[PDB]
Structure formats: C-alpha cells, structure tokens
C-alpha cells in the first residue's frame, strides 16, 4: 500500500478524480528528476537532488492546503493519500506547529547531524542574517542550503 496498487490496496475515495490531474503532473516531473543527466561537476550533481527535495515539498503542500486550509477534501481521502504515500506525514506534522509553517524538509531541523548541534542556516530569518552583514559590509555569503537548495524557509520570511 505505499506506492504500487496491489490486492491489499483499498479503492480510492470520492474526491480523488478532481485532484488527480495535479498529482499526475507532479508525478511526471519526478520521473524527469530521477533519471541521470550525466554531469561532470560536483556542484551540478547535488543541484539535481535539490529538485527532488523541492518537488516532494510542493506535492505535500498541495494536499496540506486542500485539507487543513481549504477543506476541499474529506478526511477519508486524506487518510488514503497518507497511506498511499502521496503526502509526507512527518512533514505535514511540522507544518501544523508554530514556527515551522514553511519548513523545507526534516533534514534541516535535525540537530544531531550538524557539526555544532545547530539548525540549518536556512532556518535563520533573513532580517537577522542581513544584520551581522551590516557589521562587516559584505552582503550574504549564503545562497542555498546544502541539503535542500533552500533560500530560507523561516516563517517571517
């Protein structure tokens, strides 16, 4: 029941046909992303992986707004879309929290993985990174987060 339809898979509920054209359009953008473009550069190669983290994030904001913001789908369709692995359950669970409404991924708040026990730089608000920049006179030595290619996922931002 995660991804391919088997006999143990339950039939889809009512509102799935109206959301299915957008979910098919995310699905074919991942297939172009999965394939290897033969890239010599190390900086181009993780740039391809950032497209996968973004395409994953956007399809989960799609199902999140349909149920928690617009209420356009029944809960029986939402429980089906979680079990059939359309929407990332643990990512939606942070989006419900306060301060985490626009979080890019779960790997960027995971403190144990960092050298310093900190969050990712993409979690720091753009007002604050501009401030110590004014101390130095140099703008920003930060463009994209190494694990996501996130330009800053903070709430105020």
């Amino acid at each position: 029941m995660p991804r391919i339809k088997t006999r143990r898979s339950k039939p889809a509920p009512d509102g799935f046909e109206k959301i299915k054209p957008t979910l098919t359009d995310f699905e074919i953008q991942l297939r172009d992303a999965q394939k290897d473009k033969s890239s010599k550069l190390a900086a181009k190669s993780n740039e391809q992986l950032w497209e996968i983290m973004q395409l994953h994030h956007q399809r989960s904001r799609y199902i999140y707004t349909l149920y928690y913001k617009r209420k356009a789908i029944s809960k029986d369709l939402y429980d089906w879309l979680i079990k059939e692995k359309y929407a990332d359950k643990l990512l939606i669970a942070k989006w419900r929290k306060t301060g985490y409404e626009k979080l890019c991924c779960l790997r960027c708040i995971q403190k144990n993985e960092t050298n310093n026990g900190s969050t990712c730089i993409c979690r720091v608000p753009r007002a604050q990174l501009e401030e110590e920049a004014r101390k130095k006179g140099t703008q920003v030595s930060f463009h994209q987060c190494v694990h996501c290619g996130c330009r800053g996922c903070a709430s105020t931002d």
């Binding site: 973004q54 994030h57 956007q58 904001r61 626009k102 979080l103 890019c104 993409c122 753009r126 007002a127 920003v140 996501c148 290619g149 996130c150 330009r151 800053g152 996922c153 105020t156 931002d157």
Partner: peptide, 23 residues
C-alpha cells in the same frame, strides 16, 4: 522590525516559497 515591513519583503523574493530567490 514590524510585520507590515516583513510582509512587503517576502513579496520581493521571486520563486514563491522556500526556493524563492533573494536578490
């Protein structure tokens, strides 16, 4: 910093979301 100043700056970044680029 004020909330109305924050809402005007998040419209300046291009790509509509956390991959929205500054400058």
């Amino acid at each position: 910093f004020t909330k109305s100043e924050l809402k005007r700056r998040r419209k300046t970044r291009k790509g509509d979301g956390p991959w929205g680029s500054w400058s």
